[PDB]
């Protein structure tokens, strides 16, 4: 055992790594190009469905490759992120619901557990790609209204929806207003071919350009009541939901560790490929980034193996297993968010001006790595309130 | 009287600041556009020749606006950098030789002091734009230059060819002179940082054989010390944005946000103050030439490198907080805070000196060597 | 022409620097000893009164050495801090009121401007050493109660009072509880020999051991009817100018401890001979940079408080214009100073971990600044963010 | 699973942790006192021999408590360091040879493997306390021996000494030597309560029967002092508990800057424990599960060790500094425990191997060719 994301543990996830080794070269070459143009790798991504990677994190009995170990899921995303961060960010959207649904299928009410099968089995081979329309657009509030006959209409617009260009389904997060007066939080599942559904291609960002992070709108989209994932009212949320949120995006830390590892390999390979005796300041730099890189992988490594031990073991309190997971997660995120772009910055100043050229890969990495600091949960501003609140009373 | 790049001192440089205030708005608007396309501001730049800014740092008796105070030259570049870092980087190339030549004209041999006139007076109105082809391309050793800012609107190139070192001044209209606009770099896209690939013995300005003395360090310092003002400018710029966005949120600011804003404001001040003192120090040592020529070289280059070392980690440090303070909207290529995040990292690659080099230099002065 | 605490500017302060050069050696030798025992330098300090340094920052027409330039006052404390931080911390207490009173004597009401003479002229030669009993003790309130006859009784204790042992007069901050219902804030001046006054020799810290930072209690101290100030709670930003000038010059002593540690560590590294190791060059380059940034920042912050100090023509603006850049410098030196001594420590090696080595003492003396008000990190953050935004 | 030093793994080391829980209170109270005076805890330390902790890291077949898992050895030192860093530093000297000898006893030549059983079995109950005189005094260089060693922790209660002389040999002198004198002149900034004394050797009588470098020796050096990282993680964890307990014990709503501080130190603390945690579990996997190259198992262990050391050396005193500025001036008083911790934490940066200056040449040399 090592705990640094060097190699997967579960034999189920060991099959996902080698199957990916065959698509790595093919996507590592197109990385620079797709980033320049900003075009999602449709054909490079659909090749996953052929192998079955598009269906990992799905029960063996539902399709194949029963991956549930969060630590391995991240070890995979890191191997891929080393090639292209952008595709890795997208593949996560899929692998994400993979775990979300597998938990909804086993521990969910009959009405919602039935539709879980349908989707989980469909993305097993790759016939359906699922996405999540979570965050609302500045000034908008996705909501559900009744029409009269018994059906509902979904209006609103979600932003930052990754992997969207290839998507067949969406997990919209709306909020229906009850006549009682309270506002309930429900998360429908709209098909791509939904009538009011319009996907926009306005994703122009500093990095992660190759991912499909589009804004998607819904205009009076129909959806029978029989297909809603109604939850508890807004506001009064229990810390038990934190376990769900953790498992959802904790594996992304692997991709940032991936970008870092990537930058190092470049900068170190260029510095060693200089020959002779390395300059004084350079030895200090290489020593420093190597250290930060290790601390970085180790931290996210332990944070993962901790979410796994608390995911399928503790059967005591539902709120405790929520903090026990979200906290160390946030500690690792807090670390990677300052420690990852910290090593690429040294790798940058280690290779020199040639690495400032848009043509150089170390330039791209310098933009892709700053993505993590903006991802929820939690932002620095938020993470500080959260972590200090746990360290104290509040 | 503060020393934090607030306002210029010399009345000569106080005239350059207000004359620039009229071109700021026009260029601050096209900043986002020129960066996206990557097109040098030809017409926005030639408007300087019309006012005379293209001729600042040139003796009043040769053309106008006799600016020699390095501290004000930087205060100017900062005001401009707040608008667009790229144009500021370019305008520096011009203002650079401005000081290089004025020193060559007053303290130079008759053969080379005569041609100093011809060029210094020509760029006084803006008839001629001077550039410096210093760094050689990888593999090739002049005997093609890369990283030459403000090349598209050039007229004169001061190449560094060589074993004796000599710098001949070629012209744009030369028979074997080609300028390639193949510049594609992370930040500073709107500058003319392009690459370029006959002359008699009376046009060459021979120099010492190539190893060197410490007196040359004074020249190198005055050449690019004023660029620190542009990075301080980028930082100040990012702050104004991030703080204006945070304050424009209303109500009570979050806990972590107050920590961020307090921190970047601190770093920003340390940053401006340091480059501020490093400048006023190069000016006090620039006017005294009756002492050792090698001492006035270290006394200038050292504090310069301390400020550079500071700004290189402290400037991109404030824009990174300004970035994490505004949120994801600042990650959009459309947002200005995104551009600044790329423009700021330019300084760490500029010679002299790089971190790797600056470390050997600074430790060598702190010890024996 | 510098702005890095290299040399004083005003000719008045140029006289204080060379007069101090003669006492430096004497005190730099006893530094290690007084720190180990924790004994205030009484005789080493009284030698200042002989020369007149104990009376600097006092009008030439009141005693001598008319030092008003805050930048030079700090340049002095840095020269001294390089010898012993502890004595420098104490000498500041005196130099402090020096500026406080000089401003009270020129711009103060007749009742309080008269007693300003009596004290300012007395400490001119060194006949009287003034102190400030500001911060109250945890859970204690220093107030003034009425006895009836007309006099007032002062009870309560103060802590963090440097320069206590040699001290003669105390400027204790107390508050009176009016009958109307609102409480007023007053700063009486009581003489060491006060009837109920007691000074405890209870100081025992990490660093600054040699300073006279003692706790002084006041149990029923009489006093005739006191520098009256406005009611607590509603304090304007104009008071910030006063508070700045009070302890902004201490930044010089921390810059001093840093400069000190460097000289040691670099002198030891250079005295090794041959070729310096890779990591060492990185260290020395780094601390030299931080040291420069450090001196420059506190340098500019000072020259800015001086430019805003002489121009009395908004009283609230001149308060923020001074306190803010001050806090920026403090914020910088508080993380940048102990930052250079830590590299000087890891540059000399284990021998610098020995209590016998001076680099060990400096490592403890430097951490003092982060606890000094105003403002603490916690406080400084609320202050600085409040100025950067609306609030 | 976790790997952050939370709790030991091997059942052998789980018995050392609870046995220590009984001596913790007793030593945690005298910590402040012994530090102020600078007096080694003789009676507090021998109480270990009574229980058997003085004999941990010794084969069950030789005495008892067969602890070989480096990760648990550090988890132990951290539990103890949280009480007093100084005693933990000393107890490490003992536990150190524990692993060094157990490896010498199993994989050593007959002549030296025989004397291994002698000493290993003697310190099993606590009859003999072993020390290491490695470093040599500045200016002097160590049948018939001379020289003088320093930074010898746990000197006072020592009986045997493993000095480092050269012709490179590691003789074994007893405490009752004829030309052996131990000087208790240790006056440091921190870790004053440990037995780090300066011992001299004036022509010592010893028989010859009792007696460039490859990278395989790096494995030995790693296992020797890698477990000390646990004590620094311990000092950090300690300072946090104090500062956070004081901040939370303030009540109401915490100030803005304070929330930033507590969030920051908690993060650094986690990164710190996790890193040294992984570095340990890595030295254990390379310590027993390997029969391959002897030089590879040397770098594979020493490198991640140095990464963790590099991290804890800047990250540990980093959290106590925030805990310091979080509690305020009261924590600057010599009376406050947070003051002591601020001095004890800076010890790690001076310990070999490797120093920052050295660690940089080492780590860059592995990252490149050299």
- Residue ranges per structural domain of chain B: 3-129, 130-207, 211-367
B258 touches D: beta carbon within 8 Å: yes
Q: Rounded distance, CA D195 to CA D155, Å?
A: 5
Instruction: Please give the helix or strand (H or E) that residue B179 lies within, else none.
Output: strand B179-180
| Contact (CB, 8 A) for D81 and D234 | yes
| Set of chain D residues whose Cβ sits within 8 Å of the Cβ of A286 | 363-364, 367-368
What are the helix (H) ranges across A82-147?
Answer: 85-106, 110-125
Q: Distance of alpha carbon A346 from its chain centroid, rounded? A: 26
Q: What is the DSSP code (8-state) at residue A53?
A: G
Sheet holding C152-161, edge to edge: C197-200, C214-223, C152-161, C143-146, C174-177, C183-187, C227-231
Could you identify the residue written with the tokens 């890795």? Answer: A88
Q: Rounded distance, CA A307 to CA A332, Å?
A: 12
- Tell me whether domains C3-129 and C130-229 share a fold: no
Buried b (16+ CB within 10 A) or exposed e, C284-294: bbbbbbbbbbb
B315 touches C: beta carbon within 8 Å: no
D-proximal residues of C, 344-373, CB under 8 Å = 345-347, 349-351, 353-356, 360, 363-364, 367-368, 370-371
A285: nearest CA partner in chain C: C282
Helix, strand, or coil here: A136?
strand
Q: Rounded distance, CA C328 to CA B267, Å?
A: 8
D26 touches B: beta carbon within 8 Å: no
Q: Where are the beta strands (DSSP E) in chain A?
A: 130-131, 143-146, 152-161, 169-170, 174-177, 183-186, 190-191, 197-200, 214-223, 230-233
Beta partners for A177?
A183
Q: Can you read off the two tokens belonging to residue D353?
A: 């191997």
| Set of chain C residues whose Cβ sits within 8 Å of the Cβ of B269 | 297, 325, 328-329, 332
The CATH number of the domain covering residues in B211-367: 1.20.140.10
CATH: 3.30.565.10, 2.40.110.10, 3.40.50.150, 1.10.10.520. Which one for D130-211? 2.40.110.10
Instruction: Report the residue from A286, A331, A393 with minimal CB separation from D266.
Output: A331
Q: Which chains touch A (3 or more CB pairs under 8 A)?
A: B, C, D
- Region at A62 (left for phi over 0; alpha for psi -120 to 50; beta for the rest): alpha
A-proximal residues of B, 196-235, CB under 8 Å = none
| Contact (CB, 8 A) for B347 and A219 | no
Q: Rounded distance, CA B182 to CA B176, Å?
A: 18
Q: Which of B124, B225, B118, B107 is nearest to B169 (CA)?
A: B118
Q: Rounded distance, CA B268 to CA B270, Å?
A: 6
Q: Rounded distance, CA C74 to CA D234, Å?
A: 40
- Residue C335 contacts by C-beta under 8 Å, 6 or more apart in sequence? none
> Do residue B256 and residue A382 have CB atoms under 8 angstroms apart?
yes
Instruction: Report the residue from D189, D256, D357 with minimal CB separation from C355.
Output: D189
Q: Can you read off the two tokens belonging to residue A35?
A: 């980033």
- Residue B21 contacts by C-beta under 8 Å, 6 or more apart in sequence? B79
Instruction: Report the residue from C204, C282, C353 with minimal CB separation from D189.
Output: C353
| Contact (CB, 8 A) for C165 and C174 | no
Q: Can you read off the two tokens belonging to residue A202?
A: 């306005």
Instruction: Report the residue from C205, C280, C282 with minimal CB separation from D332.
Output: C205
> Do residue C382 and residue D346 have CB atoms under 8 angstroms apart?
no
Smallest CA–CA separation between B260 and chain C, in Å? 8
Tell me how long chain B is: 369
Q: Rounded distance, CA A257 to CA A235, Å?
A: 34
Sheet holding C169-172, edge to edge: C130-133, C169-172, C189-191
The experimental method, as deposited, was X-ray
A-proximal residues of C, 285-304, CB under 8 Å = 285
Smallest CA–CA separation between B194 and chain A, in Å? 12
| Residue of A3, A297, A373 for testing the chain D interface, max D β-carbons within 10 Å | A3
Buried b (16+ CB within 10 A) or exposed e, B95-120: bbbbbbbbbbbeeeeeeeeebbeebb
Tell me how long chain D is: 370
| Set of chain A residues whose Cβ sits within 8 Å of the Cβ of B311 | none
> Do residue A283 and residue C281 have CB atoms under 8 angstroms apart?
no
- Residue B131 contacts by C-beta under 8 Å, 6 or more apart in sequence? B93, B148, B149, B150, B151, B154, B156, B157, B158
| Set of chain A residues whose Cβ sits within 8 Å of the Cβ of C282 | 280-281, 284
Instruction: Report the residue from C282, C284, C296 with minimal CB separation from B277.
Output: C296
The CATH number of the domain covering residues in A234-392: 1.20.140.10
Q: Rounded distance, CA A269 to CA A274, Å?
A: 9
| Set of chain C residues whose Cβ sits within 8 Å of the Cβ of A284 | 278-279, 282
> Do residue D257 and residue B262 have CB atoms under 8 angstroms apart?
yes
What is the sign, positive or negative, of the torsion defined by CA atoms of B167, B169, B173, B179? positive
| Residue of D275, D282, D366 for testing the chain A interface, max A β-carbons within 10 Å | D275
Instruction: Report the residue from A299, A384, A385 with minimal CB separation from D271.
Output: A299
CB atoms within 10 A of CB A272: 14
Q: Can you read off the two tokens belonging to residue D291?
A: 């029969």
Residue numbers followed by a gap, chain B, C–N over 2.5 Å = 143, 162, 197, 210
| D212-368, CATH topology level | Butyryl-CoA Dehydrogenase, subunit A; domain 3 (1.20.140)
Instruction: Please give the helix or strand (H or E) that residue B195 lies within, else none.
Output: strand B194-196
A279: nearest CA partner in chain B: B356
Q: Where are the beta strands (DSSP E) in C201-353?
A: 214-223, 227-231
> Do residue A357 and residue B186 have CB atoms under 8 angstroms apart?
yes
Q: Write the DSSP assignment of B148-177 as a string of letters.
A: ESS-TT-SEEE--B--EEE--EEETT-TT-
Q: How, if at all, do strands B156-158 and B130-131 pair?
A: parallel
Q: Rounded distance, CA B67 to CA B153, Å?
A: 23
The CATH number of the domain covering residues in B3-129: 1.10.540.10
> CA angle, corner D232, sides to D229 and D236, nearest 5?
140
| Set of chain B residues whose Cβ sits within 8 Å of the Cβ of A349 | 348-349, 354-356
Q: Rounded distance, CA B80 to CA B25, Å?
A: 10
A1 touches D: beta carbon within 8 Å: yes
B259 touches D: beta carbon within 8 Å: yes
> CA angle, corner A20, sides to A14 and A24, nearest 5?
140
Instruction: Report the residue from D188, D260, D360 with minimal CB separation from C279.
Output: D360
> Do residue B362 and residue C297 have CB atoms under 8 angstroms apart?
no
CB atoms within 10 A of CB A267: 27
Beta partners for D148?
D200
Instruction: Report the residue from D248, D315, D359 with minimal CB separation from A392.
Output: D248
- Report the C-alpha dihedral over residues D108, D112, D118, D121, rounded to 10 degrees: -20
| Contact (CB, 8 A) for C317 and C235 | no
Q: Write the class of the CATH domain A130-233.
A: mainly beta
Q: Which of B106, B17, B15 is nearest to B62 (CA)?
A: B106
| Set of chain B residues whose Cβ sits within 8 Å of the Cβ of C289 | 306, 309-310, 362
Q: Rounded distance, CA D362 to CA D354, Å?
A: 8
CB atoms within 10 A of CB B368: 12
Q: Distance of alpha carbon B258 from its chain centroid, rounded? A: 33
- Residue A297 contacts by C-beta under 8 Å, 6 or more apart in sequence? A4, A5, A257, A261
Q: Can you read off the two tokens belonging to residue A243?
A: 């376990």
- What percent helix, strand, coil does chain A show, rounded to 5? 55, 10, 30
| Set of chain C residues whose Cβ sits within 8 Å of the Cβ of D346 | 345, 353, 363
| Set of chain A residues whose Cβ sits within 8 Å of the Cβ of D262 | 387-388, 391-392
D42 touches B: beta carbon within 8 Å: no
- Report the C-alpha dihedral over residues B139, B144, B146, B149, rounded to 10 degrees: 170
CATH: 3.40.50.11890, 3.40.50.970, 3.40.50.720, 2.40.110.10. Which one for B130-207? 2.40.110.10
Smallest CA–CA separation between D360 and chain B, in Å? 15
A136 touches D: beta carbon within 8 Å: no
> Do residue D308 and residue A328 have CB atoms under 8 angstroms apart?
no
D263 touches B: beta carbon within 8 Å: yes
Q: Rounded distance, CA B249 to CA B264, Å?
A: 18
Count residue pairs from B and D with Cβ separation < 8 A.
14
Q: Write the DSSP assignment of A170-221 as a string of letters.
A: E---EEEEPTTS-EEEE---EETT-TTEEEE----BSS-TTS--EEEEEEEE
Smallest CA–CA separation between D361 and chain B, in Å? 15
Q: Can you read off the two tokens belonging to residue C147?
A: 């006895």
- Report the C-alpha dihedral over residues B35, B40, B44, B46, rounded to 10 degrees: 160
Buried b (16+ CB within 10 A) or exposed e, C77-87: bbbbbbbbbbb
- Residue B85 contacts by C-beta under 8 Å, 6 or more apart in sequence? B187, B188, B230, B233, B234, B237, B340, B343, B344, B346
Tell me how long chain A is: 394
Q: Rounded distance, CA D113 to CA A215, Å?
A: 72
Helix, strand, or coil here: C144?
strand
B256: nearest CA partner in chain D: D260
Q: Rounded distance, CA A164 to CA A154, Å?
A: 18
| Contact (CB, 8 A) for D187 and C356 | yes
- Does the domain at residues C130-229 carry the CATH identifier 2.40.110.10? yes
Q: Calculate Rg over the CA atoms of chain C.
A: 21
Q: Can you read off the two tokens belonging to residue B97?
A: 């030789």
C281 touches A: beta carbon within 8 Å: yes
Smallest CA–CA separation between C271 and chain A, in Å? 20
The CATH number of the domain covering residues in C233-389: 1.20.140.10
Q: How, if at all, do strands B206-209 and B194-196 pair?
A: unpaired
Helix, strand, or coil here: C235?
coil
What are the helix (H) ranges across C308-376?
Answer: 317-348, 358-365
């Amino acid at each position: 055992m090592a705990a640094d994301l060097r190699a997967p543990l579960t034999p189920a996830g060991r099959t996902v790594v080698d199957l990916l080794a065959g698509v790595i070269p093919r996507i590592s070459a197109e990385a620079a190009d797709r980033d320049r143009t900003g075009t999602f790798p449709v054909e490079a991504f659909e090749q996953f469905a052929k192998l079955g990677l598009m269906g990992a994190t799905v029960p063996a009995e539902l399709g194949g490759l029963g991956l549930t170990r969060l630590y391995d899921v991240a070890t995979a995303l890191m191997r891929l992120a080393e090639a292209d961060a952008s595709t890795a960010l997208a593949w996560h959207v899929q692998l994400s619901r993979g775990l979300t649904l597998t938990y909804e299928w086993q521990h969910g009410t009959p009405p919602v557990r039935a539709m879980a099968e349908r989707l989980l089995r469909a993305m097993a081979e790759g016939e359906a790609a699922v996405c999540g329309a979570l965050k609302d657009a500045p000034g908008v509030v996705t909501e559900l209204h009744s029409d009269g006959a018994g059906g509902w209409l979904l209006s609103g617009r979600k932003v930052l929806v990754s992997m969207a260009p290839i998507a067949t389904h969406f997990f919209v997060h709306a909020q229906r207003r009850d006549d009682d007066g309270s506002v309930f939080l429900a998360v429908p599942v709209v098909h791509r071919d939904a009538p009011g559904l319009t996907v926009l291609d306005n994703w122009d960002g500093l990095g992660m350009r190759a991912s499909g992070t589009l804004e998607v709108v819904f205009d009076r989209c129909p959806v029978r009541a029989d297909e809603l994932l109604e939850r508890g009212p807004v506001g009064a949320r229990r810390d038990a939901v934190l376990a769900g949120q953790t498992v959802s995006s904790i594996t992304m830390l692997g991709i940032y560790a991936g970008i870092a590892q990537a930058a190092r390999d470049i900068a170190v390979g260029f510095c060693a490929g200089r020959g002779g005796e390395p300059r004084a300041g350079a030895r200090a730099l290489v020593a420093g980034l190597d250290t930060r890189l290790y601390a970085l992988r180790t931290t996210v490594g332990a944070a993962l193996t901790n979410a796994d031990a608390a995911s399928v073991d503790l059967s005591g309190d539902p709120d405790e297993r929520g903090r026990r997971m979200m906290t160390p997660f946030q500690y690792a995120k807090m670390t990677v968010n300052e420690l990852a772009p910290a090593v690429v910055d040294d790798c940058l100043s280690l290779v020199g001006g040639l690495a400032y050229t848009a043509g150089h890969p170390l330039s791209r990495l310098y933009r892709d790595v700053r993505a993590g600091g903006f991802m929820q949960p939690y932002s620095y501003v938020d993470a500080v309130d959260y972590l200090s609140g746990q360290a104290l009373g509040l």
